[PDB]
Enzyme design. Structure first.
Site, PDB file in Angstrom:
ATOM      1  N   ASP B  29       0.820  -1.200   0.000  1.00 55.45           N
ATOM      2  CA  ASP B  29       0.000   0.000   0.000  1.00 55.45           C
ATOM      3  C   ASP B  29       0.869   1.271   0.000  1.00 55.45           C
ATOM      4  OD1 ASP B  29      -1.573  -2.305   0.660  1.00 55.45           O
ATOM      5  OD2 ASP B  29      -3.088  -1.110   1.634  1.00 55.45           O
ATOM      6  N   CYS B  54      -8.066   5.476   0.460  1.00 53.62           N
ATOM      7  CA  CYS B  54      -8.724   5.486   1.754  1.00 53.62           C
ATOM      8  C   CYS B  54      -7.934   6.190   2.847  1.00 53.62           C
ATOM      9  CB  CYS B  54      -9.010   4.060   2.214  1.00 53.62           C
ATOM     10  SG  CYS B  54      -9.757   3.004   1.002  1.00 53.62           S
ATOM     11  N   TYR B  94     -11.358 -12.120   5.598  1.00 54.30           N
ATOM     12  CA  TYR B  94     -10.092 -12.133   6.328  1.00 54.30           C
ATOM     13  C   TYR B  94     -10.198 -12.390   7.828  1.00 54.30           C
ATOM     14  CZ  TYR B  94     -11.846  -7.383   5.472  1.00 54.30           C
ATOM     15  OH  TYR B  94     -12.652  -6.285   5.274  1.00 54.30           O
ATOM     16  N   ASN B 105     -17.244  13.889   1.910  1.00 55.55           N
ATOM     17  CA  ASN B 105     -16.757  14.991   1.075  1.00 55.55           C
ATOM     18  C   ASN B 105     -16.885  16.218   1.944  1.00 55.55           C
ATOM     19  OD1 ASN B 105     -17.975  14.073  -2.274  1.00 55.55           O
ATOM     20  ND2 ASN B 105     -16.006  13.722  -1.240  1.00 55.55           N
ATOM     21  N   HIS B 146     -16.800  11.058  -1.758  1.00 58.59           N
ATOM     22  CA  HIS B 146     -15.847  10.368  -2.609  1.00 58.59           C
ATOM     23  C   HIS B 146     -14.604   9.841  -1.878  1.00 58.59           C
ATOM     24  CE1 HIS B 146     -18.594  12.254  -5.422  1.00 58.59           C
ATOM     25  NE2 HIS B 146     -18.160  11.380  -6.324  1.00 58.59           N
ATOM     26  N   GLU B 184      -3.825   0.897  -2.437  1.00 56.21           N
ATOM     27  CA  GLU B 184      -3.208  -0.366  -2.791  1.00 56.21           C
ATOM     28  C   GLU B 184      -2.687  -0.269  -4.236  1.00 56.21           C
ATOM     29  OE1 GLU B 184      -4.026  -2.917   0.145  1.00 56.21           O
ATOM     30  OE2 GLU B 184      -4.789  -4.567  -1.104  1.00 56.21           O
TER      31      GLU B 184
HETATM   32 CA   LIG Z   1     -20.248  13.034  -9.853  1.00 50.62          CA
END
Ligand SMILES: [Ca+2]
Ligand SMILES: [Zn+2]
Ligand SMILES: [Zn+2]
Lengths: 219, 219
Positions: B29, B54, B94, B105, B146, B184
């Site tokens: 990452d 992230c 996992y 946002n 986002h 990643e």
């Molecule tokens: Ca949009």
């Protein structure tokens, strides 16, 4: 004319570029009919577009599967997690509301983020819908995951003119599964790739380019 | 010495690479301290990494913000939305639960997806936390958005050894606001970029290449 070409491009499993409008987001998205999605489509999207990879669904499919807007889920869950009520999107600039939905992942994928995993998961969704196996939905996928879904507004381009509605509209016109995977094209100046710049990308790659009004008028 | 090297790098606002254990994710990452984020950082990540961008938050910061695990929200909402019932994360790929949380946002962003918008959204969040203005969260941010937030596990790498915990743990050692932004790295073969290629990437760009278990052992 240009729309017709775009329709033919979609049936051949190609990518088309779609600009919404100068007055709205002013962004160009890469579009592909989800039923023909491949690992190569994703790799090209993360590399040459760079936005979020999303899959838009026709309101009719969302209703048959009971897929809600993400805001409806958060608004309801605020009864237990109050902070969610504070984050409500009551001030979105370019439009009244967002088309964001839940995010899934194929229980069979490993991490779910690789090109292979995402194309697998997306092609599976489009396939289950085309075959009417609605009862197998909850079985084939989980949530959350890494594949973000969008819900197109009822009435499509009649009640909302976003990339979500426009692309789904084109798929309906092409007589395909009304499901599309879109991704926004970002620029090197920290902003969205300009109209003239994405247009160039289209001609230089033999891809079809369209604008919002073109699709909306054809519809 | 290898970990302390990465520490000096984080404080300088540099991107570091972390390869976790092969008995879990077996991936690399890109990592950077969120308080030192820039549009260029996002740009590099989306172009050379390609995964999901992230922001991971220390469990303490999450509790003071009211940020829960996305699975808790969907578990609750399944009382009204039946579609979520058949998606119960009972087969966790996992460990036990997904570190995925909500997406946001900053309200002063436009489309939220551009490199400037996402960098602004992450930097303002780091600022809000550092200044201890937790009750301003809903005032400044909206959801969904986002940027994808990750909630690190209680006790970090002591109880959970995922990318989310290892990177956050680093920020602690570096005496910085325990908030990191990770992406990643994806390979052209459709899978995650292999260790051999990430090492080669780290070399060409002269970036620290830290091991997953090294970070934990030092912690
Ligand atoms: Ca949009
Ligand atoms: Zn759009
Ligand atoms: Zn300040």
């Amino acid at each position: 004319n240009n729309v017709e070409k775009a329709i033919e491009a979609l049936k051949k499993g190609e990518i088309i570029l779609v600009y919404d409008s100068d007055e709205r987001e002013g962004e160009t998205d890469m579009v592909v009919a989800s039923q023909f999605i491949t690992p190569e489509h994703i790799r090209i999207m993360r590399k040459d577009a760079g936005g979020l990879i999303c899959t838009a669904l026709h309101p009719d499919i969302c209703n048959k599967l009971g897929i809600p807007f993400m805001v409806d889920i958060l608004e309801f869950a605020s009864q237990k997690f109050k902070v969610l009520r504070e984050l409500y999107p009551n001030d979105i600039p370019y439009d009244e509301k967002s088309s964001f939905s839940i995010t899934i992942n194929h229980r069979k994928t490993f991490t779910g983020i690789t090109d292979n995993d995402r194309a697998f998961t997306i092609k599976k969704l489009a396939e289950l819908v085309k075959e009417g196996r609605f009862n197998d939905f909850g079985k084939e996928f989980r949530s959350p995951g890494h594949v973000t879904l969008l819900r197109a507004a009822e009435g499509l381009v009649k009640n909302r003119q976003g990339h979500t509605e426009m692309t789904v509209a084109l798929a309906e016109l092409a007589n395909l599964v009304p499901i599309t995977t879109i991704c926004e094209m970002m620029g090197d100046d920290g902003n969205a790739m300009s109209k003239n710049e994405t247009k160039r990308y289209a001609e230089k790659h033999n891809l079809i380019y369209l604008s919002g009004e073109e699709i909306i008028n054809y519809y």
